[PDB]
Paper text:
In this article, we performed correlation analysis between several new crystal structures and the thermodynamics of binding of two groups of compounds, fluorinated (VD series) and chlorinated (EA series) benzenesulfonamides. In tumors, CA IX helps cancer cells survive under hypoxic conditions, while in healthy tissues, its expression is limited to the gastrointestinal tract. The main class of CA inhibitors is the compounds bearing the primary sulfonamide functional group. Therefore, despite the relatively similar recognition mode via the coordination bond, the compound’s exact chemical structure significantly influenced the affinity.
This enzyme is essential for accelerating the conversion of carbon dioxide to bicarbonate ions and protons, increasing the rate up to a million-fold. The enzyme core comprises a ten-stranded β sheet surrounded by seven right-handed α helices. Humans have 15 α-CA isozymes that regulate pH and fluid balance, and they are involved in various physiological and pathological processes.
Numbering used by the authors: 3 to 260
Write the structure that this text describes.
């Protein structure tokens, strides 16, 4: 009876195995755009992904993830609200069964069809397992997806999903450029938060871009064809793999823009 996203094992149940689920800096949150404070001392985000080395794509049973070589500074996030250098580990998505849901963060209670998370770890901690134990260990760049025109840079990901349909399947996935998933603007909101999946560790500086990317209805349909189950098990479509907004508590969301 491991955690997941169903009625019997979904977000309302996670606190029993992961008590931090009810902690003081949980994610995601609703971004109330009128309450976020413009902070003129926030720096522009520096996304340096020119030397990114993608390695593999994996269906982990909760999402799918594209993994990168993070054994040297090849794909790094710096600047913005961060101190020092964060290496890209992997990206993955959360999505819904319908286009009016699927994002984890919300903006003035608006849900997007999906959310992309680019997960990075602070190099000062040496490895991601150590970074998970630190309040400034991770930084996640979150990007909303709306349905409209296709995102050309997402198509190589979509096209290989059939080969990783079920839990535990992986494929080689080299030469993928994550720059092709970014919107034009790097304007963002930021707040201190957590993983949105177990173990829900409170180690994340969230950087959520204000501009969504557009994907097509056919791209998100391919996400919804993936399975939570492993091969040869009863089919359970991987949809609605999102945690809903958690209490902001004693936190301020800061905007990089006016
Ligand atoms: C048990 C893993 C289930 C799937 N979760 C993730 O892949 C994941 C999601 C987020 S999120 N939705 O906040 O961006 C983040 Cl920040 C880190 C990780 S992978 C991380 C898990 C703990 C061990 C180190 C890698
Ligand atoms: Zn995520």
């Amino acid at each position: 009876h491991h955690w997941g996203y169903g009625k019997h094992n979904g977000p309302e149940h996670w606190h029993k195995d992961f008590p931090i689920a009810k902690g003081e800096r949980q994610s995601p949150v609703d971004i109330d755009t009128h309450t976020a404070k413009y902070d003129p001392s926030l720096k522009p985000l520096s996304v340096s992904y020119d030397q990114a080395t993608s390695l593999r794509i994996l269906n982990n049973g909760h999402s799918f993830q594209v993994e990168f070589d993070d054994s040297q500074d090849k794909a790094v996030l710096k600047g913005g609200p961060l101190d020092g250098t964060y290496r890209l580990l992997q990206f993955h998505f959360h999505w819904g069964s319908l286009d009016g849901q699927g994002s984890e963060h919300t903006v003035d209670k608006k849900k997007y069809a999906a959310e992309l998370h680019l997960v990075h770890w602070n190099t000062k901690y040496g490895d991601v397992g150590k970074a998970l134990q630190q309040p400034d260990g991770l930084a996640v760049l979150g990007i909303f997806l709306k349905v409209g025109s296709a995102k050309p840079g997402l198509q190589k990901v979509v096209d290989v999903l059939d080969s990783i349909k079920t839990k535990g399947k992986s494929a080689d996935f080299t030469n993928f450029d994550p720059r092709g998933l970014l919107p034009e603007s790097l304007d963002y909101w930021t707040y201190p938060g957590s993983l949105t999946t177990p173990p829900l560790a409170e180690c994340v500086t969230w950087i959520v871009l204000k501009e969504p990317i557009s994907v097509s209805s056919e791209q998100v349909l391919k996400f919804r064809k993936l399975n939570f189950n492993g091969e040869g098990e009863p089919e359970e479509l991987m949809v609605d793999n999102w945690r809903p907004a958690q209490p902001l508590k004693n936190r301020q969301i800061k905007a990089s823009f006016k």
